[PDB]
């Protein structure tokens, strides 16, 4: 039942991920360096998020049907989903062992206290960790992981969407791809309710999104902190 179009979609999204996710973490030495020994980690982690946004954009451009949207709608969708896709794609380096994101080295291994040192509180960090745990336990196929990222970006209910009709139809082809993939290539019992569970993770991300933007607006209302951000982070997340 996995149609030729559907196998096509999966091939494109896998490739788009491998082109925008480098598991060597080579570029990390270009960021402002991490400091731990004051929002110590805000320069290094703002650099990471700004880099990650560019990677998310390059992925979104390759999602089939996305380019048939207008640039206004594309902007809307990326502005709303950027932090969610970043949290979701960070799951690949997350290790449940010491509850940290191990991106290669110890300098580039981040725990909950590093996230605190960028200005964020456990109001965000506590659901964020349980999010990463629950995703980690879904044991997702790479096929499913990249479909989930695509569905996240192309959402019809984002605030300010203009052609909700076209956005809905683009998402629908991706959701139907995912549902058929699960049915055909994911054996029970891991397949049990798997689609519903993945959609629950998107709901987890809407809540995480709202809390991020509250603490961001608090953070960036202090001009001392705005100064440590990047111009892309400011345009996307605000002010």
């Amino acid at each position: 039942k996995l149609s030729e179009e559907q196998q096509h979609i999966i091939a494109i999204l896998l490739d788009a991920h491998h082109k925008t996710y480098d598991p060597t973490y080579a570029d990390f030495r270009d960021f402002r360096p991490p400091v731990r020994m004051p929002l110590s980690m805000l320069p290094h982690l703002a650099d990471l998020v700004s880099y990650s946004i560019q990677k998310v954009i390059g992925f979104a451009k390759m999602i089939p049907g996305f380019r048939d949207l207008t640039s206004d709608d594309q902007i809307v969708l990326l502005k709303s989903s950027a932090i969610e896709v970043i949290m979701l794609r960070s799951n690949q380096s997350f290790t449940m062992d010491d509850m940290s994101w191990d991106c290669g080295s110890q300098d580039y291994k981040y725990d909950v206290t590093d996230v605190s040192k960028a200005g964020h509180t456990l109001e965000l960090i506590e659901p964020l960790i349980k999010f990463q745990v629950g995703l980690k336990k879904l044991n997702l196929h790479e096929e499913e992981h990249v479909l989930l990222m695509a569905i996240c970006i192309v959402s019809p209910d984002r605030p300010g969407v203009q052609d909700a009709k076209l956005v809905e139809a683009i998402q629908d082809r991706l959701s139907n791809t995912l549902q058929t993939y699960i049915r055909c290539r994911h054996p029970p019992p891991g397949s049990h309710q798997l689609y519903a569970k993945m959609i629950q993770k998107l709901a987890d991300l809407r809540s995480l999104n709202e809390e991020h933007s509250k603490q961001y607006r608090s953070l960036s209302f202090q001009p001392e902190n705005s100064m440590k951000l990047t111009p892309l982070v400011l345009e996307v997340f605000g002010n």
Binding site: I57, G58, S71, I75, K79, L232, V236
Partner: peptide, 10 residues
């Protein structure tokens, strides 16, 4: 109001 976004989106 989004110069860098639109440049990155091609």
């Amino acid at each position: 109001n989004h110069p860098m976004l639109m440049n990155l989106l091609k």
